[PDB]
Each structure stands twice: as structure tokens, then as C-alpha cells.
């Protein structure tokens, strides 16, 4: 199961940082990482992109711990493309895991699909993730974000929608 | 005899340290892989020691050797301070060791699972040493009867050793030998440990300093010499080496390092029959040590005083008995007194420091003697580069043993330069000591003429 | 006197050898025996881990049987004696005649596969514990459809898994199990008559220890695993009430000091006092029985969208690629393999002491009096090493005040005793204390060794 070529992940053309701000919620995950569609999926939980002058973005996932409402807060640089990024706070130690998350498509209305890449000196790992601005999307993007996965090679086992839980990622509690 | 050298040397250098070595060399090596690792360089610095030495004697024919070579090299205080330490250190030491090993074999079935009393060791100890001293005083012809059933004993041990060894390396799996939890085990290797395990390791490699010379009748002296320096030694190594992983294959090395017997628990490992076999013929092995060493320390007693460095009270046969009763007597008593230490292992590391602090001297001496006074006529020579190397790996243990365990090592030099003033008492005297000394020594040798 | 006196001195030491040698043998007479060990069976030594969903826990591994020997490496240097591997055997949620305990599921792997991970296993000295829960998919593990077709399959994979090879079984959510102890009594006496070296665990939800100890009437040789420590108290003059309730209660029989069933350390405990309950469970009188990722402190909370039930194991920064920087460099594997304090590296210390050291493989447990909020005891064997264990479970630093006069003489507590391990920083290992007068941090636990009067 070797990582993809980078060539066939699509991109998103004209992708405006300024519409892509907001809370999206996570609403598929596509990846071998050990979830599995006949086991548990999780609990959703939600990614709230900040635009900063420096077009860099300042990411938030907020979810439901025991029972604090727990939060986390990284940063995303640009990439080459406009619509690539890399995790911030680059050193020079090749202990760290380079990032390349790409954003693959969204209308920047409802939904969205983005491409997460984490080569490291020993593994080179990816994952697909189907954003979304409410808490279930329509069948047809679920259909869609299946077959981009089967596209790249994960099987249909490996694609996992968390759920629709109503605590942190909205609201309180 | 071509090939009875060899047998010759073998007999000399394998001893029972090979049943008391292997718990030392591996609670400081920390690993399998590096306990063999010292058993096969001590191997190899053994041999080129050998071979130094050798060379040494046929530059220097002369009886005495390690002792002579040091006096004629380096002129006095050197020889004289060898002999010292020789009687008052390596040989009571030695005797205390072995006679410490045949108390812990003996005991260690009695109690498998924990300490035995300490009285009941140093009981068992001085009763071997008095037993055997007492043998010796007697007559010698019973002394060298009694050394073949011990030399029977110990070989015996050491072939059930290997043969139980090599069945079980085909069906026991071989779990340790192997690179899976064979390395870095116990502790992260340390320099300073390593030096102490290059100590103990070297006590399984005796009697090669000076019953390599006073011992060779070979047909070509110095054609067949340096082959069965070259012959015998690595064999040994590999029988060394052999009982090693016989052991470590036959127990878990944490169950080695928490039984002060290895043979007795390999043997209650694999020996249905157990205890008839493993620690009697230890026992036996352990007796023939001490009694050579009883023999060779009486006979380095007889130099001694023919060299008017001792007294003559000293090196005086018995009439009636053939033997040296005045020599051996001072063996046990100075054996006596090492017997009060309560620790197998820092006595193995307080004689081998000693040992390596003169061989290392001695093969100096030899390099000495290349760059000053050359020309002198060499049967066989050696290639300059192992008596260096020989040099260098001494620096280094001492260097290290004194960094890690600075206490037994600093006895031992305390001793040596408190041996250092009687030499010149004994050849410069800015006033004659006659109101004690001498009056002491007459009554000395009168008190001997009237009991012995 | 001129001849006389050289026989009489022969003849005197004669006396004298033969006087040293009855001294001798009288002090070895006197000695006191070493007592014989007992019947460690190999779960006696070291602790179970256990993995639950192997999917989960390769992580982005294979995910199944095959897959799992490249972890068997990682599980030695955990130096884990055993495995209690999920129910791989296929079945139909919540239908009992679409079940089979005796078929792998197909996605976990074949038979093929499951013999060379048993095989490579006893290569590496673990030993795998197949558990046989029947619908481990389904809400309830036994079927309420219907209830001795449940057990009679039971023993038939229990008898076809033993052939098979597998070093005993393991049996969950037995609450739900109808006429549960006979149940177990006759799994366990078939498992343990098919051979000595093969033990039956069983897990139950309940906390109440009179329930516990009429599950354990029938069958005093099996291994239970409850939530009965579970309950968190912060108090340590709670659990080591617990804890002496149960052992005094049990008859002092071999016990599995796990804090669940079938549930991380996480759960009930909160982030400080995971390593304080890890030394109290490599150090008490039992088998331990740690869920997989306890020795990272794995926690299903702390990242977002991990299944709380089965949270995927943590290898590395890359085990989950779809949140970048969300997971931490120290709390993965990798992360806290190279540091020397960290909770993994105190996992593989414990463990090592708990497999080696013949105190704590077997040996008497004696708890003693401490001002309150400390537990404290000590594990000693017979004149061999003993260890004393000092657990500050308050959150205020208290003074350690041991006063113990009613131990036996026989484990007698020095005025001095070394610091084997402490799970706070701050203090030198090696280095003997004042057992008079010692200070204890908040939420801290002091692992001391001294050595065998005499
Ligand atoms: C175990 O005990 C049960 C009790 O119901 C009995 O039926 C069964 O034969 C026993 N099996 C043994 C002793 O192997
Ligand atoms: C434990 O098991 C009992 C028995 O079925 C059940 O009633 C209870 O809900 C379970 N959970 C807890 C937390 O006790
Ligand atoms: C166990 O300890 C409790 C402590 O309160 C005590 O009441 C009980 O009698 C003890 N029982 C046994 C058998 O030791
Ligand atoms: C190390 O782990 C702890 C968890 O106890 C966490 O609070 C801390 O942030 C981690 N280190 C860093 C640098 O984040």
C-alpha cells in the first residue's frame, strides 16, 4: 500500500483562501490508519480554518473529550500551489514529519475534499477527507468521496464517516 | 616432545578458573556476545604474552622466570619487588580464590536458592587450604600422586561441560546465542567494567608467565616453541569459549549471574544425576588447583632465597621429608589471612590487577632490551609489533580498572610500594641494624633447626 | 621436651582441623533452608497484554494476523509474557446459528497465518491467549437468543483451539453469561486437565467484591479480571483498602491486578496518576493485565475522532495523517522510545523488574501504616531482595511517616534503602534515603530495594 503520486491527486483551481475560512466539520476519512467501516467510526468532530494576513491559516479541531471540551490549535503555511499548505513551525531536525495537505475540491459553499500527506523517515502515510458545513452531507458527495478514495487505491473498508455528534463541535457541554 | 608440549601447556593453563570466571566476565560485560568477546581476547593477549615471554627466555636462559628477566632487566629493586608481590599477593590469593570456589561448589547444592552462611564458607575454605598444606608438608611423592585424580576431576568437569553443551545447541534452540537478546542486555557496556572483566577473565589463563620456560624439554627448543605457544593456547580459548555458551545455553544469563556456582546449576539444569558429578569433580578440580599452587609457590621460595633477597630460615628442605615445610607454612598463613575478605570476585580482581601490572612490566623490559643492548643472540624472534600492542591493551586495563574500581587495585599498589623501602634496607644500610634485626634472625633460624 | 613436642604439635593440629571441621558442619546444620519456590507458571511471570482490535493496534499496519508478527519485536521489548488477541473467529452479529468459534473471520487472516504468529511467538517466548467471547460484534457478547448452544460451541472451539495451540483462552462480560460459575468451572478444569500450562481468564463489569468472590467459589485457580479498582477514589487509603480487602478476602491466592476489562488506564484515570498506578500494578501481588497502548498512556480523548472503545495505537506523528500536528511528537511509540523519562520507559523498567526479580515474581506482600492519603508495602521473598513501595495518591506533598513494627522481623524495614525508580523526576537513583524522614511529592510513587538482614 504505497503512498499515491502526487501528480494524480487533483487541485483546486482559483482556490480563494478567504471563502475556505470557517468551521467545517469532518464528515468522511479515507485512509490506512486502523478505522474501518464495520467497527466503530468515532465521534465528528470539527476543523475551524482562520485566514491571517500572511495567508498563512491557523487551524483549530475542536472535539469532545471525556469531558472537557477539548481543543487544539496547529498553523498551516502556503505551499507552492495556491491551494497547498504545510504544517508550520519548520525545523531543520529530520525527526519531523513533512506535511503536504492539498486541497483536492470544494465549492466553498457546503462541502469539501482535501488531501493530507505525511511522509516521514520511516512510513509515508496519506488520507482523503470529505469536509463538510453541516453535520450530514447529501448521498451524492458520500458517493463521490468513495470513489475518489477507490481511485487512489484504499479499499471501501478504509472509508469511515464519523458521527453526527451534537456536543463541542456545536454548542457547549 | 613435539606434541607432549602441548599437552604440557594445556595442563598448566586450564584450570578450575574457568568455573568461577564466567559469572565475573559476564555481570560486568553485561551481554552474551560480550562475555565471549573478552574470553577471545583475553585469548589472544594471552598468546602474545606467551610469546614474549618465550622470547625473553631464550634471550635470558636462566632459572626463575618472570623473576630473573626483571633482574637482570632493569637492574635491582625490580626482581626483588617481583618475588615480593609474588609471595605476599598472587600465590596466597590464588590459593584463597580456588579454596573460596571449592567452599562454594561444595555448599551450593545445600543451599540453591539462597546465600549460604559466611562462616560456613571461610570453614570449608581454610579446611581445603590446611588439608592440602598439610599434604604437602608431608612428602611430595603423595603430592604428586594425588594430582593425577584432581587432574582427572577437572577434566572430567569441563567434558561433561561441553558435551551436555554441544546436545542442547542442537535442540535447546540456542535462545541466547543467538543476536536476539544477546547484546546490551543487562546495562549499556562501560569502559571501566569492561577493564574489570578483562580482570577476571584473565584468572582462567595461568601458568603460562613462568611454566613456560622452566617446564619446556622440546627436541628444537626454538623451532617448536613459538608452534606450541601458537597451538595450545587457542585451544584453550576455545574450550573457554566452549563452556561459555554450554553455559549460557543450559541457564538464562540472569540465572548465571545469581548462583555463585555455574557448573552446579548447569548440571542441575541438564544432569538427572546431578549432584554426583558436577560439584565433586569440581571439588577435585579446585583441590589440584590449590595443591599446584602449593608446589610452584615452595619452588619460587627456593629462588628466593638462593638469591639472598629472603632469609635462610626460608627454602630449607626437611631431612627426614623431602620438602619445605618453613616455605609452605608461610603460604598458609598468609592464605589465612586473604581468607577474611568474604568476596570470590574482588580477590579476582586484586591478583589479576597485580598479575597484568607485572607482565606488562616484563614485556617493557623486553622492549628495553631490543633498543638498549642489542645484538645479543636471539634463537627466535618476534615481530616488534605484538609486544606494543600487548603494551597497549595493558595501559589500557590498567588505566581503567584503577577508574572503575580504585580500591583493590590501590591495595595492591600500596603493598608493591611498601615493598619498594625493605630493597634497599636490603642493599644500602647507612647504619647496620645489629640491635634487632640480626639478633631476630638467629633466633629465627635457631627455632627452625630445634621444631622442623 | 625435644621429640615429644614436634607429635604433639602434629597431633594438635590434627585436633584442631578435625575441631574446625564439626564447627563447620555445625554452622551448616544451622543455617536456615531456603524454602522452595513455587509453581511459576509462565502467566505467574510478567504481565498480558492485551490487544483487543488488531486492526486498531497495528494502526496503519497489515491489520491482520499475518501482519501482527512485525509488532512481536515492540511486544518483547515489553517484555510482555502473553497476548490475549480479539476474537478473530468469524460471526454474524447478533446471530447465534451464522457464528462459528471455530472459523477465522476471513479479513482477519487465514489458519495458515494464525499458526505462524504462534509459531513465531514461541519463537520470541509470548504466548498467545485467544479469547473466545461468542458475538463480540454484537451488543451483548452472549446471545440472548439462546444460551447452551452458546456454551456448547464454546467448548468445542475451546477443544479444537487447544489443538490447535493457543496458551489459554479468555472470557468476557460474563455478567450477561446465564449460570456463569458452572460455566467456568468447566471451562476452566477441561482447559486446565488438557494441559497444566494453559489458563482461562474471564472478564466481568462488576465492582462489588462479594459478587467477584461467588464468581470465584467454584474455581479458586482462575484468572478474573473486573472493574473493581476502577473506581479512581484519589484516595490511597481507599485502594489500599481495596486492595487488602481482596487479597485478605481471597485467601491471598493468585489474583490479576488489572484495572478493567477490556479498557485502557485512561478511562478511569486521570493523566497524573498514570504512572503511579502503572508501579502499583507491576508491583503488587498478582498478574498484571495491561490493554493495549497503557504503556503509552494512550488516551482515546486527546485526539480528535478516535473510537473511545478501540483507539488506533499511536507509532508515530504519521499514524494519523488527516490531522497534521494534532498529534504530539511525546505521545506516540516513537516519541517516547527515545526518552529516558517517559511513561513507555517506565513501562519497560517495571516490567523488567517484574520478570526478573524473584521478590516480586513471588513473594510475600506486606502493607503498613502511613499517614493518610499513602499506600505503602513491601514485596519480599525468602532472604532475598526486598522491595518497598511507597504510593502518595494526594495531591498534597505529605511527609512520608512510615512507622511499621507489626511486619515480620523477617522483612524488617532499614534505616537506609536504596531508590530504585521514582515516577517524578527530581531525585537520584542509586542513592540510599532516610526512610525516617521522607518527603513525597504530590502524586508520587518511590520504588526503594535493600537488601536481606543477617
Ligand atoms: C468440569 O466440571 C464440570 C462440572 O459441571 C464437569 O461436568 C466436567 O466433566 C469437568 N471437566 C473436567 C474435570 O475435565
Ligand atoms: C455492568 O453489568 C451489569 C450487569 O448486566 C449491568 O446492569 C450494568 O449496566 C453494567 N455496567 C455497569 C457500569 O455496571
Ligand atoms: C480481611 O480484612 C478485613 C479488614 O476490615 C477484616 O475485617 C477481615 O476479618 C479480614 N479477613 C481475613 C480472612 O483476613
Ligand atoms: C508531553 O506530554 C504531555 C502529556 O502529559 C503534554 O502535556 C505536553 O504538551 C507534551 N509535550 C509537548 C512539548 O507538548
Known sequence: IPAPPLSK?????????????????????????????????????????????????????????????????????????????????????????????????????????????????????????????????????????????????????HIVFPVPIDQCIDGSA | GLVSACGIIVGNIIGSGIFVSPKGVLENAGSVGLALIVWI??????????????????????????????KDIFGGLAGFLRLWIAVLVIYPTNQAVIALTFSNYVLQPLFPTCFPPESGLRLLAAICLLLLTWVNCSSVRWATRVQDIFTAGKLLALA????????????????????????????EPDIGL????????????????????????????????????????????????????????????????????????????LLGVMAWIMPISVALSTFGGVNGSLFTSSRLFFAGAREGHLPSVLAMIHVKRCTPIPALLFTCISTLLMLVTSDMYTLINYVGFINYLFYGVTVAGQIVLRWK??????????????????????????????????????????????????YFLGVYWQHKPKCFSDFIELLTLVSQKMCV | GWVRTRWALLLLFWLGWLGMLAGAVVIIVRAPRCRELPAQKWWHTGALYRIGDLQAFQGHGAG??????????????????????????????????????????????????????????????????????????????????????????????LEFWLQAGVDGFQVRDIENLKDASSFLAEWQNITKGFSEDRLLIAGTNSSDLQQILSLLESNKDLLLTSSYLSDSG?????????????????????????????????????????????????????????????????????????????PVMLWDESSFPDIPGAVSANMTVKGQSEDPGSLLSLFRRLSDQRSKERSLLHGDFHAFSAGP????????????????????????????????????????????????????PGREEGSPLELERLKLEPHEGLLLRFPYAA
Open chain 2, 373 to 422: 643492548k642489542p645484538d645479543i643472540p636471539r634463537p627466535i624472534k618476534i615481530n616488534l609489533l605484538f609486544p606494543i600492542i600487548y603494551l597497549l591493551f595493558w595501559a589500557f586495563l590498567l588505566v581503567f580498572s584503577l577508574w572503575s574500581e580504585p580500591v583493590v587495585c590501590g591495595i595492591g599498589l600500596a603493598i608493591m610500594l611498601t615493598g619498594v623501602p625493605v
Open chain 3, 64 to 157: 491482520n494476523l499475518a501482519g501482527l508478527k512485525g509488532r512481536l519485536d515492540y511486544l518483547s521489548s515489553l517484555k510482555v509474557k502473553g497476548l490475549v488477541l480479539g476474537p478473530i473467529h468469524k460471526n454474524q452479529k447478533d446471530d447465534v446459528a451464522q457464528t462459528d468459534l471455530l472459523q477465522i473471520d476471513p479479513n482477519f487472516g487465514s489458519k495458515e497465518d494464525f499458526d505462524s504468529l504462534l509459531q513465531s511467538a514461541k519463537k520470541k517466548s509470548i504466548r498467545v491467549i485467544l479469547d473466545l467471547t461468542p458475538n463480540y460484534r454484537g451488543e451483548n457478547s452472549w446471545f440472548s437468543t439462546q444460551v447452551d448452544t452458546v456454551a456448547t460451541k464454546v467448548k468445542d472451539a
Open chain 3, 234 to 310: 484519589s484516595t490511597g487509603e481507599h485502594t489500599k483498602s481495596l486492595v487488602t480487602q481482596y487479597l485478605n478476602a481471597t485467601g491471598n491466592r493468585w489474583c490479576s491486578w488489572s484495572l478493567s476489562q477490556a479498557r485502557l488506564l485512561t478511562s478511569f484515570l486521570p493523566a497524573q496518576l498514570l504512572r503511579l498506578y502503572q508501579l502499583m500494578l507491576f508491583t503488587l501481588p498478582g498478574t498484571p493485565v495491561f490493554s493495549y497502548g497503557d504503556e503509552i498512556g494512550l488516551d482515546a480523548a486527546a485526539l480528535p475522532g478516535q473510537p473511545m472503545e478501540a
Open chain 3, 373 to 424: 492519603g499513602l499506600f505503602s508495602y513491601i514485596r519480599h521473598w525468602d532472604q532475598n531482595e526486598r522491595f518497598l513501595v511507597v504510593l502518595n495518591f494526594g495531591d498534597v506533598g505529605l511527609s512520608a511517616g512510615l512507622q511499621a513494627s507489626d511486619l515480620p522481623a523477617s522483612a524488617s524495614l532499614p534505616a537506609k534503602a536504596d531508590l530504585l525508580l521514582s515516577t517524578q
Open chain 1, 9 to 157: 491527486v487533483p487541485l483546486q483551481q482559483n482556490f480563494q483562501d478567504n471563502q475556505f475560512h470557517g468551521k467545517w466539520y469532518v464528515v468522511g476519512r479515507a485512509g490506512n490508519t486502523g478505522l474501518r467501516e464495520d467497527k466503530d467510526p468515532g465521534k465528528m468532530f470539527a476543523t475551524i480554518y482562520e485566514l491571517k494576513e500572511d495567508k498563512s491559516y491557523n487551524v483549530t479541531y475542536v472535539w469532545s473529550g471525556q469531558k472537557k471540551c477539548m481543543y487544539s490549535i496547529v498553523t498551516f503555511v502556503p505551499g507552492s500551489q495556491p491551494g497547498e499548505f504545510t504544517l508550520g513551525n519548520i525545523k531543520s531536525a529530520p525527526g519531523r514529519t513533512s506535511w503536504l495537505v492539498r486541497v483536492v475540491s470544494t465549492n466553498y459553499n457546503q462541502h469539501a475534499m482535501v488531501f493530507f500527506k505525511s511522509v516521514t523517515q520511516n512510513r509515508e502515510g496519506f488520507a482523503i477527507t470529505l469536509y463538510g458545513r453541516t453535520k450530514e452531507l447529501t448521498s451524492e458527495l458520500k458517493e463521490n468521496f468513495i470513489r475518489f478514495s477507490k481511485s487512489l487505491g484504499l479499499p471501501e473498508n
Open chain 2, 41 to 70: 581476547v583475553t585469548g589472544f593477549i594471552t598468546v602474545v604474552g606467551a610469546l614474549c615471554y618465550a622470547e625473553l627466555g631464550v634471550t635470558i636462559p636462566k632459572s626463575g622466570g618472570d623473576y630473573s628477566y626483571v
Open chain 2, 160 to 187: 561433561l561441560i561441553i558435551i551436555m553443551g554441544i546436545v542442547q545447541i542442537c535442540k535447546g534452540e540456542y535462545f541466547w546465542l543467538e543476536p536476539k537478546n544477546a547484546f546490551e542486555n543487562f546495562q
Open chain 2, 194 to 269: 569492561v577493564a574489570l572483566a578483562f580482570l577476571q577473565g584473565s584468572f582462567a589463563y595461568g601458568g603460562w608467565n613462568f611454566l613456560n620456560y622452566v617446564t619446556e624439554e622440546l627436541v628444537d627448543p626454538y623451532k617448536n616453541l613459538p608452534r606450541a605457544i601458537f597451538i595450545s593456547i587457542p585451544l584453550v580459548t576455545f574450550v573457554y569459549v566452549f563452556a561459555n555458551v554450554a553455559y549460557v545455553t543450559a541457564m538464562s544469563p540472569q540465572e548465571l549471574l545469581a548462583s555463585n556456582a555455574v557448573a552446579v546449576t548447569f548440571g542441575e539444569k
